[PDB]
């Protein structure tokens, strides 16, 4: 639709670890571009929250794994555009992943697109069981000794279709690299 | 009434004078009409503006007369005319005529010009009435403007001295009259008199302009400023001093002033404090500052003179600080940067100001406002304030600020230090920065990152700039700089925790450079434990448990990564201890146990005696939670302590495999079944049974021999019996049917 | 005055008359004076009371004369005296004398009885004044009302018929006079005339009294009431109809009236619409009410005819209701239990009342007051008010009572249903009582002060009357009926919980006669969970925690006894949930948690794995309260959680045998000591240490080997060192010393 | 002493387990007979409070274990009559029924006679440790926690001696039965 851009980002630690996303990314997330932002919490500061509501006319916030106090928020949220029900998460609430846990979770939620950013926070994606599974990686690039290029994603849902734009700040000099991905729900 | 009637009479006389001027031999009649016109100037009831305007009308008629004479001499003459014109009965017409005929003589014969000026200059000793004598001498200056004998002479006899004498003598007599304007007339018209002086100041300054279109720099030094300084220092008047000094500065060039700087500064030292010397000095000093910012030992001389002025000038504290602000701006323009001067500004200017600031209390007082502007002035003029930080004594001014203003200014600086990235700081400058931080933190919506939270994050960032050995020292000195209390370290220390997690790896990334990497890790782990134990003291807040748990677990992972697991196990046991001693709320306990599960799901390198012990303790902790739903959730997750999932289930015997203790996993699943039977709910229990069956399919495929497809089949019949026959319909019951259909699809 | 002047003349005449009566041959003089006296009664100027008083004074004197004559004839005679008294000049004296002699002749002469009595009655028709002739007829009645030609005649002149004729003729003449009283004097004195008539009503009714000493029922029918009814209906006045009909009814026998009831109702139909028919009908119905309360389908005949009469009128609604009340009084008293008659009252009055009631508001209306009295009449007259509940529409008409008064009447009835220790309410009676309850409760300081303590106790008692499983179903429907909001169930449901406590036992007393009794218990415990969850809607109240806490402990015990323990554990976990949401007042949590301790201190059915787990939960939440005294008190009680104590340790799981977990008990007591040292108050710390030492004495004497004499020695040394050495002396400090001395005495 | 009659009653449990005095007992306890009433709780309402107030000219009550809404009343009370000191409480502000614990509480309160009404709801009394212990049973006939005799007492203090009269509705049929018990304080 391009009227409803969804920002997908993670690994916040602001200022808990770092200062900002790339300036070029801040302008790519500047107000007037995104219609709704789905953030995964654990900010931890208020200025970034104010920035985030101001980025899009629709700010949606979910419960975070560092957000032990604001438990009232759900860990997942659905919005509907045409025929799609959309779930998203970070993933630590799972204990394995491989095929049965994703299928079981999809069945519990009955969704079509699933987003997560597990503690490894490294990009991958796959389609499975007529449902869609998305890992944006470590968007802000937070580090850990697990087995990241500054990045974020934009999503555009229309009907049974989802359009994903992945933005990366790649190294040779730091260069912004953009990729587009589209998803359409199978029947 | 009088002014316009006089102007009418003036126009009548100009008409009759010119009709006479047309006829040669009517020149004396023309002069009689001109005298009758200037007779209008005998009124003194006109306002200064009105008398001035009448002067302008008579002056304009005199322009006609002066051109007529400067034409009569070129065509015939009149012998002894300068003397003959002195027979005029009216004195003001007579003297204006004397100037007019004089200039005609200078135009006709250049040889007597020098002699004529001495006569004309001598006779100007008459009119001492300030208004009339000033207007007459203005007429003289305009008429005699172009004829002066000098090195710039017109070809009359005369040297640079004759013009210097003419202009200095003309200056002194008009200045005497101009000051006398202050006095002339009646005493209740002092403001009118000051108005008259401001009006006639151009008459005095025309002499200075004429002097600048005259003799040069050595003549300026010997025979211009000397007289000028003698008058400036000896008037003790205020209006004349500001005007005359600014006219001198503007009109003569600063190349000339530079040759007279010491003469200027010896004038600068006598400034009388009750004479409005402050206004004169601020305007001159500001001009010198501006002179500096168009960017003879002036710094030493002027610095010393400023001390002499301050010993002479003792002004209200806000005024004194504002003068200090302008002095700071001057020093900025003069010398912010060469370090001996910077220190001399700090001690002999800035410290001297602070000692001289015998200040009443001032944080909101405008003396403070000026002192802030003053201190900002180094900061603004330091384009590279880093070079200001190259003073060890950079802080030293913080010693001299009051605590409100030390905190306010230090805040504003640190904020500016956040709009910028401050450089890689050397170990020493980190301490100076820490002292500044100590002033910020001690004594004491922090969306300014109040007082340094995003600043702490940057500091932790900058720690990375140096190498591991320097980094250890910096981290230890900063950790000392973390003596700050229970309400601060909560938000400041976890970034230090990350600074240590990187430094522990930076030590390990030296295992082929120093095998003290284990020892380096040991020192860092004791340092970190000491800092976390510092946190444990400060139980007063929420997350104090959470934060300590996350740091102790994190250190456990670093000990894993470094394989420095001997100090890992103690920290994990201590984390369990924290769970037992300090965690109460059942829901909160559920989150904590799930994070503990996930952290174990990152636990790999422990020797099996320690590892297996932790696995059994963890299974106990799983078997020690609170609610029956929760009891089930923990039991099915403890299956994962034994199963081919997750990392926690890696034993050092399994060879990258997860325990796959499917026998134990089944024992766990049977425990989950016993918990499920005692739940007393139909839909979620059946849904959970389906999830467990899917987990059974998982364990079948992950090779649980105790998990068999026949068990799955018997369970699907039990699910079939439950799903339709006793489930009251709900979105969950439909989901449970969909899940069961999926689970059948999984079993194929 | 007029009266007094006449009375003076009467006493004068009585004095000479008596002196004449004394002297033989002065009898004629006595009669002449008597005529002069009776001339005073010929006046018409006396007030009614004054004329009555004059008549009575003259009447008593006439009685003296009349006795004198009635003695003279019995002893000798007086010839022609009946003729001689007709000689009198004044007519009123003359006629009084003829009556006196007539009665004297009647005593002396039996043979002339009919002719002389008939003559005296006929000639008394001459009296042309109503009042004087009426008073004359009293003189006649006192003289001869007792002598009438009657059954006393045995064959000569006179018979009971002649007396009946004499009195009926006297009635007709007195009635004509009685109406004529209405018409004598001026028309504007109508109320005074009616007052005079009310005064003279006894004059008419003395004849009815004389009639009731006379003939029987067939003679009554033909020759008394028949005549009386034509006259009663055709006299067309109000005072006479009401008086005469009530006098007839009382004075004549009702056995006779019964044989003539229809004649009465046909007379009631024969009256003016403009006479006060409402008063007569209300008084007749009231008399029939008396015919009902003094404890031929009279009901149908009188009931239906009364409706025809009311339709024959147009009545005030209040009057109609008062007649309905009297109709109720008749049916209730005549037919307390003929439910068909009572229902005919219920049916055949009430709807018709609603159409006749122009039903605006009617609370202060006496029609309302009467409708209450009417409804009370079943209630008062019932041996069993249940019989009101046997009327299908008795209760349903209460809906159609006006509503404020619906509260007044329904409250008053239900209260009366509670002062009587009333009987089984069957489902039918449960439904009618519940409908009444819905009116009380619906639509929703209690300005009612109703209802509940004796109301709940009675309700719970009578619930038991129906069979016990049905009682659960009834309780469940009542539980839906308790949809009234948040301020009822707090006080109403816990008694229902006890009703379930008895029913669970009533199930267990069939544990070998049923096995779904356990399943029935299961249904009741699910009911209990549902009802408690219903209360949790009522978050606004205190004790919501306390009551639930005691209910869960009680239910846990019942779950043990019903072996239905699976829903006990859940209820206890939910009780902990209550522990978490219920923190609002610090002191209140300390008392409530102590209540939690005491309930656990009886809580005995948890398997030890569950119990000790619960014990640790209780100890942690106890160890997460605020203040050190309370923390100590709870810690020493968790010592009692493991030892040979509490009631819990005499369990249905402990079989009265005690836990005696003395190692853990010692660890708890040592932890209590650790908290006790940190009291930081010398006196209270030592007192508590003495109490803890006493707890040590307790476990020593309970043979807790972990509680050693060494612990006692170290604690007594520490108490000795503090008690004297750093206690400021105090009443508490002295008590602590006395306690320590006692504790030493116990330790021997 | 005790020209000032003190009613001793317990295990009332109004409306908790039983609701009223036996009629024969209310008349034995009718106003004008009792000068002071010591009630062992569970009234619970204002109506029961005013009636009990009406029973005696001087009513002294302590907090009850289910009387948790009546925050104004004291938790415990001691009274002295002649040389005897008498304390009373329900037992909820007491901690248990262990002999040493009762003796310790009695010693802090300086009391000789203790009345309580525990879950047995059975009248009993015994002397122990030179102190006097009274359980009035259930004044209302409240059911028991054990596996029923309505009872109350009319304690009589004289000097250093206390005489206890217990009134019971005993079963053979409800019969009023009276028993006398005497307690004498240790010297």
Numbering used by the authors:
A (entry chain D), D (entry chain B): 0 to 146, 153 to 177, 181 to 195
B (entry chain C), C (entry chain A): 12 to 306, 387 to 535, 554 to 857
Source paper text:
Here, we elucidate the structural basis of membrane tubulation and coupled cargo recognition by metazoan and fungal retromer coats assembled with the non–Bin1/Amphiphysin/Rvs (BAR) sorting nexin SNX3 using cryo–electron tomography. The retromer core retains its arched, scaffolding structure but changes its mode of membrane recruitment when assembled with different SNX adaptors, allowing cargo recognition at subunit interfaces.
In fungi, the only known non–BAR-containing SNX adaptor is the SNX3 homolog, Grd19 (13, 19). Comparison of the assemblies demonstrated that metazoan and fungal coats are essentially identical, and hereafter, we describe metazoan retromer:SNX3 unless stated otherwise. Using local reconstruction and three-dimensional (3D) classification, we found that, for both metazoan and fungal retromer:SNX3 datasets, the arch is asymmetrical. The fungal retromer:Grd19 lattice shows less regularity than either the metazoan retromer:SNX3 or the previously described fungal retromer:SNX-BAR lattice. Arches are assembled into linear chains via two homodimerization interfaces—the asymmetrical VPS35 dimer interface and the symmetrical VPS26 dimer interface.
